[PDB]
């Protein structure tokens, strides 16, 4: 499998007035682990984040080319990007390479500027957006992440309760996956603050 | 204002006729064909004594058997000589032999009227080459000398002079040249005609001389080797 | 004065000056005579020299085994048109394995020379050619001009002072058809002699002859090869 | 096919066989495998016969234009790089070559190993071909930097000979070339059958 | 067969002015009067639509043209040149919607349309547009009004006039314009400032008016025009 | 995926499910499969999900450009020809199976468009993974010139048949009713399936996760 | 075809370019635009020409454009041709950020656009861009910087410069009050108002007619802001009372 | 087969590579250098295909030197690592891809010592220690055991020696000589070759 | 694409477009360069810096390679294009040929580039002259100069720009083996040549030196004033 070459897992979750995004930190080729500190979640505008899982090259390439189109959008228009606008921007970027796509599944998590509304979505390799009110997952252990999120998630959750939910949903799903692990980083996005935590995880 | 490919009421292109007028401003060059070989002589025309005399090379080799003297716009000539050097190596690669002097001159003559505005490539020429060339070399038919002009009309010559004082030098070559002369006489004669038409006196660092012969390859006369023929003033 | 800059510009009289200006280029070049019999087609051309110390210009070019030309006007336009004529003859022999008829080739010249006379920035071919060829129909003498219009002729002469040669060929036109190879060449150079002034005449250094027909392929005669044709002349009339 | 080249105190030795095979059948045993690029540069034929002949002749063409433009002789490092760049454009297409470019340079004796794959490495001794493995053995045992001119000939001539004895694709005649400062010279064109009597007696 | 010019027709004068644009601004000045007014509640665009011969079908061709569900256009000057700018504006609005899945902002459309108008002042073998554009729109809870001139520049307006007697219109508008006007009151002043230079009594066939608000852009029916037209609503 | 369309006396009823799967795992429980083309024509989608969205949006963009130039309501045949000529040009590489249906000035027109470019004009069509189950309902209970509420019942039963029998389809039933004067877009028409609410709460207590490093960044 | 050609990319008998020098005349008719360099920051001050009672005012600025996170520019000349050049500057800055993952140095972005403007003066047969630009920014190599661009495609680094209408009189006025090495942003703004007040056509000077933007590095990141209407009026009255204090 | 290893210190970068250029079953070259001088403080360790190694490493090398001449200042180790990644990533889906696994080592005037790991697919990753080849499978475990963030350069070479001795003991391929170079504040320094 | 012919021949047999570019180089600042025994030094004068301008950005001396550097005169916008195209060729030569670029080769490239712009359709000739300075691999000092036409010549001492004829005539009677013997005395010859035309020498002169093994060294105004003071002291000695 092309997606299972580098591994990785990205998760996003909805709360009351807050959005949380979590991803593993392992960078490795097939079986051999290479780097403990690998970035997969990228900032897009103070209160909007994107998590990319799949091929390590395409994770970095899409993030760089999306930032290329993001800054031009924020200079042409005197406003910060909307979550729905970025979703369509990623969908357009991936579909341009229809018959030769980037092997990565983007997950966007963040709050809507000026309207303070939560937003989560995940996309295909060719760019197919889907919006949910609960959770979106992407990676090698997709099935493992679905089993945890379907049992732990609750409708209205505060920032502290949402953090405990997304952390346990990642850790246990990651520990059943061989190609994912070596620490989990969580970004809790609020209207006032961004809380970044690196969780104590298994290093095997 | 008119186009580059415009005919005159007389029956010739303006850009070609103006290119011939450009040669009459350049330095004079004399080439003489002899049974023992072909010699080429040219004035370097040094403007300032600070300039290096070895830098000015109006006689250049195409192959080991062909040399050429140039006059007029020196910048345009270096493009034509470079094309001639490639064509000889392209022929060597394909046929495993050396080209005749007539064949090389004909190859350069193909690039004569390759200029225009409409219906042309983005990297095409706009104006003709304002250069008169004297191709002198030895092949299978013996030592040969050819003259080329902006129009592309190439012809064989026994003795030809082109440059500023070309008309005066041509009449002087008609009175000296004969069929049974030697190469040493051809070198001697060319220097006498050259010193008459030059503005400054003849000197070893002032002029350039080269000979092509059936015996050995194209040779450029060094400062010391010139002294043997310069001493006969 | 205001219409004589481009080929695309028409004169109020109904003329193109640039094509007429290109016709003057053929008159600037030296004279050449082309004539045919019933079995042979002969081209006799006069050579010019820039100086007595320089050799004489090539006036007859080789195109194919059965087709040969004599040029008058611009030298670079002559060789460019000759390369097209050489290629078209090679293309027909490559595909059909047969010699391309002269009537077909001359029509191809009248198609290629027409294009630049109608487009902006482009110029007409400032060269006149006398084409000699032999095929299934016999010997042929064709005349192509700066204008795409071509002529099928019994005998023709074009170039500088070619009027004297044009008048001689008209008075002896009925003799050419039953004329043999040897005498038919003598008729060609005799017309070429009339173009020259009273003092100077034909020599081995300024005369080229191209002969093609049933007996032999197209061959160009130069200096010592032209001497059997010159020896046994009628001499210049006063 | 066995081609070897090594550099020492006095210059560079070029040695090659002459056997060309079309499967099991031998096509020719008089193949000039030492390709004469210039009066100052030499090449070797290994792998593809036409692939070595065409591209090194294109190099021979390119090196002559360099001398006409720059008024100087082309360096061995530049000649090796030019050939490496041209063949690299056709990588993974079907070209097969294993040439060695030898010559005297401004820096001294030069030796380079150029492949159809795109390899370009400078070294003291190389051996290319099907019987190159046997050529490496005998060559390394009797090699020295302070070898005499006559002693350098005996090493390479026998090194090809020992390779032809084991390799089925190697044979014909042992061609030898010496590369000096003024230019290379043709040394010997001894037959394998004639050399068999020399080492036995 | 055709070629195509590659050289610019609009060039800098010795004074330092682009002559072709200066005359393009004179083409719109001699055109039909057109006005646009922003009123916080919505935008109103009105233009003179004189058919003259009565044989003309009024409802066949419209001067007020919609670009999307919330953006419209009004012009002054040449009809044919405006129609190309409508199609281009309609196409650019759709290209934005395919990428971002969001209706195009008014200011963002004008910037893209003005770039096309700039292109024709610098591209080879083309003249500038003889049309000044009035762009209205509703986005982000705010109404917008913009002007795009032949040069390619764009200005944001509260109230502006075009066509013949535009200087008389602009002076009339600044006296008549108020902050926090009502949309229905904005139509009144728009149809009145157009009557300043009209001469031949207004009928519902003589002028065309389009409104833009929170519901979107739409052209007003002749029945709605007739109600506003009889001096009072 | 189960999508269907029917033609009744007044107009057209279109049906679709809400299950979107990645392989053999449900990715989206609530997914819109009835797509907007024009204020009078709607189109159901099947096959490749990304191919269905981008092809629909491009035709909807072209028809909005078309309707504004003409100044009148677009036709179903115009929507059909645009989808027909594009999918044929790509030789079936764009995996988009579309059930097209709308009301024109001519009347109601229904089309079934295949990824290769073949189109069929029928009173009732079914496409997708559970099309076999949906067609069987039509081939048993369909009758010409039926009432609006009767036609809505016919399609809802067809989509439900694909939901319970086919593993590719599930969850909610979406309906789109288009007539000569009325357009009803019923998003959640019927919800036959729901989650059995969790009686055992697995809510993680505050401070059950071990944290190594913490960083707080203030915002405006 | 050649009859209608105006020959834009051609030389003059004197040894100069006509279409460039004619474009240079267009800048001298446009609004006055100046920028000076200080120790703690760098700023741009421009004369707004779009002054009307019925002007809507939607955008943050009229002539000040943002190109990068660390860089900003101003425009003098044709506003139509300016929108093309400023958009191109944003593209080049993002191409560098994609390739090297670092903000583009100030000198490198200016040279990039100057190569394009030089290309239009040499080939293409098209009219050159009649826009002169002033650049302000910060990089890790030199720090705070100020640049000036010409329609010919020529650039230069300045400590204090002006371009537009009355540029010759303004540059000599800047040459008088500027103290090299000891200039702060507080005195920089006071100097900018001093020059604009005397060189402008209409006297008195209002904040609605002028536009000032500042660039200062704060807490490890560059801050680019356009000054408020109330902030400019405060700077004018500080200068207005200073000029009245001269009569003593 | 080729082998690479890089160790980063507090103010230095230590890098080593084998000097073996092998074909089929024979060792052609005994002293092959796999380090490319990018700048005064940047080195490139290129390993992979036969032709892709020399062609790619030199292309980036001359482009970095082009930046130096055009601006006056040199590229930072971070900017050079992102530049060499961009060229490999853009060529990945093209007709001619470069199959090369490289390692970039550099010292910055402001940020300090830096080491970069990069896959043939073009995946850049910052690491305190990294290794390429089949020999990496035997050496990375030793690098996980004895490595400290505050390691001295005399201890780093001793740590490097422990890894190279493992290649003489367990690794099936013969790798006798290794090129050792250190990059610090003064630049690139050549160190004695560890031979067996 | 623009296909119009810009540079064309004239009734008198002259290329005006080339000659007008030669008028553009005359209007440019004065640039002189002399060839010494061990060091080669070039210098520019009459920069017309308003003191309020940064002197780093407006430098006419640019290094093409580690061994090659150049100084120009005329249209400064046209020069930067040529300099950048020359810098790419320096790295392109290194990719094709393992050996570095020689002084003559890079001059040959610039001259051919200027020649192609005088004969191609839709292109305008460069209005610049370049003083190419450097050392060969042998260690022999070299000095070359180009012009809008496309001709290049080697010099011992040459000046280009405004008042170039006045500086050349000064160097025709001063360039001797005694004057170019030491490193310090070669630099003094440059400054003496520039002060002949330039207005009050001091802050107007910008020169750069380069050694046989060491890279280009741009001397600061504090070092120039040291040499200028030494020139006036030797000028004072006689009278």
**Count of the separate structural domains present in chain F:** 1
Q: Per the structure block, which two tokens stand in for H39?
A: 């700048």
List the B207-212 sheet strands across, edge first: B159-162, B29-34, B37-43, B207-212, B219-220
Q: Does the domain spanning E1-233 belong to CATH 3.60.20.10?
A: yes
State how far the Cα of D101 lies from the Cα of D113, in Å rounded to an integer. Answer: 7
Q: Does E41 touch chain A (CB under 8 A)?
A: no
Q: If you measure CA to CA, which chain C residue comes closest to B2?
A: C5
Q: Are strands A9-14 and A19-24 parallel, antiparallel or unpaired?
A: antiparallel
Q: If you measure CA to CA, which chain E residue comes closest to G22?
A: E16
Coil, helix or strand for C147?
A: coil
Q: If you measure CA to CA, which chain C residue comes closest to B177?
A: C53
Question: In chain E, which among 95-154 make CB contacts under 8 A with chain I?
Answer: 124
Our CA dihedral for H190, H192, H193, H196, rounded to 10 degrees, sits at -170
- Three state DSSP letters for I38-75: CCEEEEEECCCCCCCECCCCCCCEEECCCCEEEEEEEC
Q: Return the DSSP state at G15.
A: S
State how far the Cα of F142 lies from the Cα of F127, in Å rounded to an integer. Answer: 17
State how far the Cα of F81 lies from the Cα of F72, in Å rounded to an integer. Answer: 18
Q: Going from the N-terminus, what domains does chain H have, and what CATH number goes with each?
A: 1-196 (3.60.20.10)
Phi (first) and psi of residue D19, to 5 degrees: -85, 130
Q: G with B: 3 or more CB pairs under 8 Å?
A: yes
Coil, helix or strand for G100?
A: helix
Q: Does I238 touch chain E (CB under 8 A)?
A: no
Element (H, E) at C44: strand C40-46
**Count of the separate structural domains present in chain C:** 1
Give the closest-approach CA distance of I64 to chain H in angstroms: 7
Q: Going from the N-terminus, what domains does chain G have, and what CATH number goes with each?
A: 1-248 (3.60.20.10)
For chains A and F, CB pairs below 8 A equal 85
The domain at D1-201 falls in which architecture?
Answer: 4-Layer Sandwich (3.60)
Resolution rounded to one decimal, in angstroms: 3.2
Q: If you measure CA to CA, which chain G residue comes closest to I123?
A: G123
CATH number of B1-233: 3.60.20.10
User: How many Å is the Cα radius of gyration of chain C?
Assistant: 18
Q: Which domain holds residue C3?
A: 1-238
Let me know the angle formed at the C-alpha of A128 by A125 and A133, rounded to the nearest 5 degrees: 120
Show residues of chain I in contact with B115, CB under 8 Å: 5
**Count of the separate structural domains present in chain A:** 1
- Three state DSSP letters for chain B: CCCCCCECCCCCEHHHHHHHHHHCCCCCEEEEEECCEEEEEEECCCCCCCECCCCCCCEEECCCCEEEEEEECHHHHHHHHHHHHHHHHHHHHHHCCCCCHHHHHHHHHCCCCCECCCCCCCCCECCCCCEEEEEEEEECCEEEEEEECCCCCCEEECEEEECCCHHHHHHHHHCCCCCCCCHHHHHHHHHHHHHHHCCCCCCCCCEEEEEECCCCCCEECCHHHHHHHHCCC
State how far the Cα of A20 lies from the Cα of A125, in Å rounded to an integer. Answer: 23
Let me know the angle formed at the C-alpha of E156 by E151 and E161, rounded to the nearest 5 degrees: 75
Let me know the angle formed at the C-alpha of C190 by C187 and C195, rounded to the nearest 5 degrees: 135
Phi (first) and psi of residue D136, to 5 degrees: -65, -35
Give the closest-approach CA distance of B111 to chain C in angstroms: 9
State how far the Cα of A50 lies from the Cα of H151, in Å rounded to an integer. Answer: 37
Element (H, E) at G74: strand G71-77
Annotated active-site residue in D1, D2, D44, D99: D1
Scanning the structure block, which residue is given the tokens 């000349």? G77
Q: Per the structure block, which two tokens stand in for A71?
A: 């800054």
Cβ neighbours for A138, distance < 8 A, ≥ 6 positions apart: A9, A10, A51, A53, A54, A105, A106, A107, A122
Q: Return the DSSP state at E197.
A: G
Experimental method of this PDB entry = X-ray
Let me know the angle formed at the C-alpha of F147 by F146 and F150, rounded to the nearest 5 degrees: 90
CATH number of the domain enclosing F75 = 3.60.20.10
Chains near B (3 or more Cβ pairs under 8 Å): C, D, G, I
State how far the Cα of C238 lies from the Cα of B95, in Å rounded to an integer. Answer: 55
- Sequence spans of domains, chain I: 1-239
CA atoms within a 13 Å half-sphere pointing along the CA-CB vector of I206: 21
Q: Which of E69, E100, E74 is nearest to E85 (CA)?
A: E74
D→H contacts (Cβ < 8 Å), by residue, are 84, 88, 91, 113, 115, 117-121, 123, 126, 132-133, 136
CATH number of the domain enclosing A30 = 3.60.20.10
State how far the Cα of D87 lies from the Cα of H188, in Å rounded to an integer. Answer: 34
Q: Per the structure block, which two tokens stand in for F59?
A: 């035709």
Q: Packing angle between helix B183-197 and helix B223-230, nearest 10 degrees?
A: 90
Contact A76 E100 (CB under 8 A): no
Cβ neighbours for B51, distance < 8 A, ≥ 6 positions apart: I153, I154, I155, I156, I158
Question: In chain D, which among 118-137 make CB contacts under 8 A with chain I?
Answer: none
State how far the Cα of A116 lies from the Cα of A118, in Å rounded to an integer. Answer: 7
Q: Per the structure block, which two tokens stand in for A3?
A: 């997606």
Structural contact between residues A41 and A50, judged by C-beta atoms closer than 8 angstroms: yes
* Burial class (CB within 10 angstroms; exposed 0-12, middle 13-18, buried 19+) of C120: middle
F→E contacts (Cβ < 8 Å), by residue, are 57-58, 61-62, 64-65, 68-69
Closest to E102 (Cβ–Cβ): which among A76, A85, A92? A85
Q: Give CA separation, F4 vs B223, E19, F135, F154, in Å.
A: 99, 63, 8, 10
Structural contact between residues B130 and I13, judged by C-beta atoms closer than 8 angstroms: yes
State how far the Cα of B68 lies from the Cα of C99, in Å rounded to an integer. Answer: 41
Coil, helix or strand for F166?
A: coil
Show residues of chain F in contact with A49, CB under 8 Å: none
Structural contact between residues B214 and B143, judged by C-beta atoms closer than 8 angstroms: yes
Q: Does the domain spanning I1-239 belong to CATH 3.40.640.10?
A: no
DSSP labels, chain D: -EEEEEE-SS-EEEEE---EEETTEEEES----EEE-SSSEEEE--B-HHHHHHHHHHHHHHHHHHHHHHSSPPPHHHHHHHHHHHHHTTTTTT--BEEEEEEE-SSSEEEEEEESS--EEE-SEEEEETTHHHHHHHHHHT--TT--HHHHHHHHHHHHHHHHHH-TT--SEEEEEEE-SS-EEEEEEEEHHHHHHHHH-
Show residues of chain D in contact with H32, CB under 8 Å: 121
CATH number of the domain enclosing C39 = 3.60.20.10
Question: In chain A, which among 83-122 make CB contacts under 8 A with chain H?
Answer: 100
Q: If you measure CA to CA, which chain F residue comes closest to E88?
A: F65
Show residues of chain I in contact with E6, CB under 8 Å: 1-4, 122
Element (H, E) at H84: helix H77-90
Q: Per the structure block, which two tokens stand in for E209?
A: 């008016």
I→B contacts (Cβ < 8 Å), by residue, are 1, 3-15, 111-112, 114-115, 118-121, 149-158, 168, 171-172, 175
Is D49 marked as binding a ligand?
A: yes
- Sequence spans of domains, chain B: 1-233
* Burial class (CB within 10 angstroms; exposed 0-12, middle 13-18, buried 19+) of G5: middle
Is position D1 annotated as part of the catalytic site?
yes
Show residues of chain F in contact with A146, CB under 8 Å: 25
Q: Which of B75, B120, B121 to mutate to test the interface with I (most CBs of I within 10 A)?
A: B75
Q: Which of G91, G94, G102, G221 to mutate to test the interface with A (most CBs of A within 10 A)?
A: G94
Chains near H (3 or more Cβ pairs under 8 Å): A, D, G, I
For chains B and C, CB pairs below 8 A equal 95
**What are residue C141's DSSP bridge partners?**
C132, C153
Q: Which domain holds residue F55?
A: 1-220
Q: Per the structure block, which two tokens stand in for D176?
A: 């030898």
For chains E and I, CB pairs below 8 A equal 8
Q: Which of I62, I74, I75 is nearest to I106 (CA)?
A: I62
């Amino acid at each position: 499998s092309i997606m299972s070459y580098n591994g990785g897992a990205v998760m996003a979750m909805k709360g009351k007035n807050c959005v949380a995004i979590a991803a593993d930190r392992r960078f490795g080729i097939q079986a051999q682990m290479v780097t403990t500190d690998f970035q997969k979640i990228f900032p897009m505008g103070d209160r909007l984040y994107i998590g990319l899982a799949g091929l390590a090259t395409d994770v970095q390439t899409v993030a760089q080319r999306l930032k290329f189109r993001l800054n031009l959008y924020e200079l042409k228009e005197g406003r910060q990007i909307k979550p729905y606008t970025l979703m369509s921007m990623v969908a357009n970027l991936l579909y341009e390479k229809r018959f030769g796509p980037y092997y990565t599944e983007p997950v966007i998590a963040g709050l809507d500027p000026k309207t303070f509304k939560p937003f989560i979505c995940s996309l295909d390799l060719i760019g197919c957006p889907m919006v949910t009110d609960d959770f979106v997952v992407s990676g090698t252990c997709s099935e493992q992440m679905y089993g945890m999120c379907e049992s732990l998630w609750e409708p209205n959750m505060d920032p502290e309760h949402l953090f405990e939910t997304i952390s346990q949903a990642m850790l246990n799903a990651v520990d059943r996956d061989a190609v994912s692990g070596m620490g989990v980083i969580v970004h809790v996005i609020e209207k006032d603050k961004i809380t970044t935590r690196t969780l104590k995880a298994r290093m095997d | 204002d008119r186009g580059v490919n415009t005919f005159s009421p007389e029956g010739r292109l303006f850009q070609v006729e103006y290119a011939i007028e450009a040669i009459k401003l350049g330095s004079t060059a004399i080439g003489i064909q002899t049974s023992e070989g072909v010699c080429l002589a040219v004035e370097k025309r040094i403007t300032s004594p600070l300039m290096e005399p070895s830098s000015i090379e109006k006689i250049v080799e195409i192959d080991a058997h062909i040399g050429c003297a140039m006059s007029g716009l020196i910048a345009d000539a270096k493009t034509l000589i470079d094309k001639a050097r490639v064509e000889t190596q392209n022929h060597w690669f394909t046929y495993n032999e050396t080209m005749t002097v007539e064949s090389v001159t004909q190859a350069v003559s193909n690039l004569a009227l390759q200029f225009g505005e409409e219906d042309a490539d983005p990297g095409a020429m706009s104006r003709p080459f304002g250069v008169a060339l004297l191709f002198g070399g030895v092949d299978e038919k013996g030592p040969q000398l050819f003259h080329m002009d902006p129009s592309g009309t190439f012809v064989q010559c026994d003795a030809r002079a082109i440059g500023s004082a070309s008309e005066g030098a041509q009449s002087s070559l008609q009175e000296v040249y004969h069929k049974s002369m030697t190469l040493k006489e051809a070198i001697k004669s060319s220097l006498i005609i050259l010193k008459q038409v030059m503005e400054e006196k003849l000197n070893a660092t002032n002029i350039e001389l080269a000979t092509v012969q059936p015996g050995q390859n194209f040779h450029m006369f060094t400062k010391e080797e010139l002294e043997e023929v310069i001493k006969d003033i | 004065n205001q219409y004589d800059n481009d080929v695309t510009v028409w004169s109020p009289q109904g003329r193109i000056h640039q094509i007429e200006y290109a016709m003057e280029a053929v008159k600037q070049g030296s004279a050449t005579v082309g004539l045919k019999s019933k079995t042979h087609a002969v081209l006799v051309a006069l050579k010019r020299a820039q100086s007595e110390l320089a050799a004489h210009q090539k006036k007859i070019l080789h195109v194919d085994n059965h087709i040969g030309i004599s040029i008058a006007g611009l030298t670079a336009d002559a060789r460019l048109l000759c390369n097209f004529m050489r290629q078209e003859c090679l293309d027909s022999r490559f595909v059909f394995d047969r010699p391309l008829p002269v009537s077909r080739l001359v029509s191809l010249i009248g198609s290629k020379t027409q294009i630049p006379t109608q487009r902006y920035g482009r110029r007409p071919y400032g060269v006149g050619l006398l084409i000699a060829g032999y095929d299934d129909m016999g010997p042929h003498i064709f005349q192509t001009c700066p204008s795409a219009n071509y002529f099928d002729c019994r005998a023709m002469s074009i170039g500088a002072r070619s009027q004297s040669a044009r008048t001689y060929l008209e008075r002896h036109m009925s003799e050419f058809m039953e004329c043999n190879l040897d005498e038919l060449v003598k008729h060609g150079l005799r017309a070429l002699r009339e173009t020259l002034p009273a003092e100077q005449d034909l020599t081995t250094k300024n005369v080229s002859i191209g002969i093609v027909g049933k007996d032999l392929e197209f061959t160009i005669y130069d200096d010592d090869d032209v001497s059997p044709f010159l020896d046994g002349l009628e001499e210049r009339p006063q | 096919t066995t081609t070897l080249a090594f550099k020492f105190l006095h210059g560079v030795i070029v040695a090659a066989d002459s056997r060309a095979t079309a499967g099991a059948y031998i096509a020719s045993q008089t193949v000039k495998k030492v390709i004469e690029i210039n009066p100052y540069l030499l090449g070797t034929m290994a792998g593809g016969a036409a692939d070595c002949s065409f591209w090194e002749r294109l190099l021979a063409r390119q090196c002559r234009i360099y001398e006409l433009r720059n008024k100087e002789r082309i360096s061995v490092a530049a000649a090796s790089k030019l050939l490496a760049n041209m063949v690299y454009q056709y990588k993974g297409m079907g070209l097969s070559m294993g040439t060695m470019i030898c010559g005297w340079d401004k820096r001294g004796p030069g030796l380079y190993y150029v492949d159809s794959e795109g390899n370009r490495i400078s070294g003291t001794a190389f051996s290319v071909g099907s019987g190159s493995v046997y050529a490496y053995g005998v060559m390394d045992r009797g090699y020295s930097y302070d070898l005499k001119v006559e002693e350098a000939y005996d090493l390479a001539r026998r090194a090809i000979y020992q390779a032809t004895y084991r390799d089925a694709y190697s044979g014909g005649a042992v061609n030898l070339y010496h590369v000096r400062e003024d230019g290379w010279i043709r040394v010997s064109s001894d037959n394998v059958a004639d050399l068999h009597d020399k080492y036995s007696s | 067969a055709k070629r195509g010019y590659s050289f610019s027709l609009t060039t800098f004068s010795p004074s330092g002015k682009l002559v072709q644009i200066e005359y393009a601004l004179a083409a719109v000045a001699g055109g039909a009067p057109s006005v646009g007014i922003k009123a916080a509640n919505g935008v109103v665009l009105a233009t003179e639509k004189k058919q003259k011969s009565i044989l003309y079908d009024e409802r066949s061709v419209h001067k007020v043209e919609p670009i999307t569900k919330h953006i419209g256009l009004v012009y002054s000057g040449m009809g044919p040149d405006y129609r190309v700018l409508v199609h281009r504006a309609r196409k650019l609005a759709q290209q934005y919607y395919l990428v971002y899945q969001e209706p195009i902002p008014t200011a963002q459309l004008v910037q893209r349309v003005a770039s096309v108008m700039q292109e024709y002042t610098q591209s080879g073998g083309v003249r500038p547009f003889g049309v000044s554009l009035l762009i209205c729109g509703w986005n982000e809870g705010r109404p917008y009004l913009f002007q795009s001139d032949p040069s390619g520049a764009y200005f944001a307006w509260k109230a502006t006039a075009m066509g013949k007697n535009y200087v008389n219109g602009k002076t009339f508008l600044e006296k008549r314009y108020n902050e926090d006007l009502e949309l229905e009151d904005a139509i009144h002043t728009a149809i009145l400032t157009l009557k300043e230079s009209f001469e031949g009594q207004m009928t519902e066939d003589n002028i065309e008016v389009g409104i833009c608000n929170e519901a979107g852009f739409r052209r007003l029916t002749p029945t709605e025009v007739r109600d506003y037209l009889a001096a009072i609503a | 995926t189960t999508i269907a369309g029917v033609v009744y006396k007044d107009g057209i009823v279109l049906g679709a499910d809400t299950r979107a799967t990645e392989g053999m795992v449900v990715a989206d429980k609530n997914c819109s499969k009835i797509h907007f083309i024009s204020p009078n024509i709607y189109c159901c989608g099947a096959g490749t999900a990304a191919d269905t969205d981008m092809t629909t949006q491009l035709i909807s963009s072209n028809l909005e450009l078309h309707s504004l130039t003409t100044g009148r309501l677009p036709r179903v045949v115009t929507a059909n020809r645009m989808l027909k000529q594009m999918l044929f040009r790509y030789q079936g590489y764009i995996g988009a199976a579309l059930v097209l249906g709308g009301v024109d000035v001519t009347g109601p027109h229904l089309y079934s468009i295949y990824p290769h470019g073949s189109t069929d004009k029928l009173p009732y069509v079914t496409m997708g993974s559970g099309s076999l189950a949906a067609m069987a309902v039509f081939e048993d209970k369909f009758r010409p010139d039926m009432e609006e509420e009767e036609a809505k019942k016919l399609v809802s039963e067809a989509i439900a048949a694909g939901i319970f029998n086919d593993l590719g389809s599930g969850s909610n039933i979406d309906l789109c009713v288009i007539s000569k004067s009325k357009l009803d877009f019923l998003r959640p028409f019927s919800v036959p399936n729901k989650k059995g609410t969790r009686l055992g709460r697995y809510r993680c207590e505050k401070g059950t996760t071990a944290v190594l490093t913490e960083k707080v960044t203030p915002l405006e | 075809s050649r009859r209608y050609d105006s020959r834009t990319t051609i030389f003059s008998p004197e040894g100069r370019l006509y279409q460039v020098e004619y474009a240079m005349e267009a800048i001298g008719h446009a609004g006055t635009c100046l920028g000076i360099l200080a120790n703690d920051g760098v700023l741009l001050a421009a004369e707004r020409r779009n002054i009307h009672k019925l002007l809507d005012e939607v955008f943050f600025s009229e002539k000040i454009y943002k190109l990068n996170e660390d860089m900003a520019c101003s425009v003098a000349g044709i506003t139509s041709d300016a929108n093309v050049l400023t958009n191109e500057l944003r593209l080049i800055a993002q191409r560098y950020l994609l390739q090297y993952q670092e903000p583009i140095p100030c000198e490198q972005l200016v040279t990039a656009l100057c190569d394009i403007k030089q290309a239009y003066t040499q080939f293409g047969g098209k009219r050159p861009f009649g826009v002169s630009l002033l650049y302000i920014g910060w990089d890790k190599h030199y720090g705070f910087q100020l640049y000036q661009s010409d329609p010919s495609g020529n650039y230069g680094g300045w400590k204090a410069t002006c371009i537009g209408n009355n540029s010759a009189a303004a540059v000599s006025m800047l040459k008088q009050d500027y103290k090299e090495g000891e200039m702060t942003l507080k005195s920089a703004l006071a100097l900018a108002v001093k020059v604009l007040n005397k060189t402008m056509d209409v006297s008195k000077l209002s904040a609605e007619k002028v536009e000032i933007a500042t660039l200062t590095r704060e807490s490890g990141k560059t801050v680019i802001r356009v000054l408020k209407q109330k902030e400019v009026e405060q700077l004018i009255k500080k200068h207005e009372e200073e000029e009245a204090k001269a009569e003593r | 087969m080729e082998y690479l290893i890089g160790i980063q210190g507090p103010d230095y970068v230590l890098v080593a590579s084998d000097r073996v250029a092998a074909s089929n079953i024979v060792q052609m070259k005994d002293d092959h250098d796999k380090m490319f001088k990018m700048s005064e403080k940047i080195l490139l360790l290129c390993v992979g295909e036969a032709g892709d190694t020399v062609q790619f490493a030199e292309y980036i090398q001359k482009n970095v030197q082009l930046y130096k001449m055009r601006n006056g200042y040199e590229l930072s180790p971070t900017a050079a690592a992102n530049f060499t990644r961009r060229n490999l990533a853009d060529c990945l889906r093209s007709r001619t891809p470069y199959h090369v696994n490289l390692l970039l080592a550099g010292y910055d005037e402001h940020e300090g010592p830096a080491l970069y790991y990069m896959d043939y697919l073009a995946a850049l990753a910052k690491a305190p220690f990294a290794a390429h080849g089949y020999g990496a499978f035997l050496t990375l475990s030793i690098l996980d055991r004895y490595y400290t963030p505050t390691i001295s350069r005399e201890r780093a070479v001793e740590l490097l020696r422990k890894c190279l001795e493992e290649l003489q003991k367990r690794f099936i391929l013969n790798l006798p000589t290794f090129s050792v170079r250190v990059i610090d504040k003064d630049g690139i320094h050549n160190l004695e070759n560890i031979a067996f | 694409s623009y296909d119009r012919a810009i540079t064309v021949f004239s009734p008198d047999g002259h290329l005006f477009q080339v000659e007008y570019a030669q008028e553009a180089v005359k209007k440019g600042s004065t640039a002189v360069g002399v060839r010494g025994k061990d060091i080669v030094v070039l210098g520019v004068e009459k920069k017309s810096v308003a003191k309020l301008q940064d002197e780093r950005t407006v430098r006419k001396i640019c290094a093409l390679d580690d061994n090659v550097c150049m100084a120009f005169a005329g249209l400064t916008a046209d020069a930067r294009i040529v300099i950048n195209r020359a810098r790419v060729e320096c790295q392109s030569h290194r990719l094709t040929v393992e050996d570095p670029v020689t002084v003559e080769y890079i001059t040959r490239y610039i001259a051919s580039l200027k020649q192609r712009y005088t004969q191609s359709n839709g292109r305008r000739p460069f209005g610049i002259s370049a003083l190419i300075v450097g050392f060969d691999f042998d260690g022999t000092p070299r000095l070359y100069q180009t012009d809008p036409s496309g001709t290049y010549h080697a010099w011992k001492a040459n000046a280009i720009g405004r008042g170039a004829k006045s500086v050349r005539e000064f160097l025709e009677k001063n360039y001797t083996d005694d004057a170019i013997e030491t490193d310090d005395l070669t630099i003094k010859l440059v400054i003496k040549a520039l002060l002949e035309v330039v207005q009050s020498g001091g802050k107007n002169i910008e020169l750069a030196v380069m050694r046989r093994d060491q890279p280009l060294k741009i001397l600061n105004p504090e070092e120039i004033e040291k040499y200028v003071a030494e020139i006036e002291k030797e000028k004072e000695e006689n009278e």
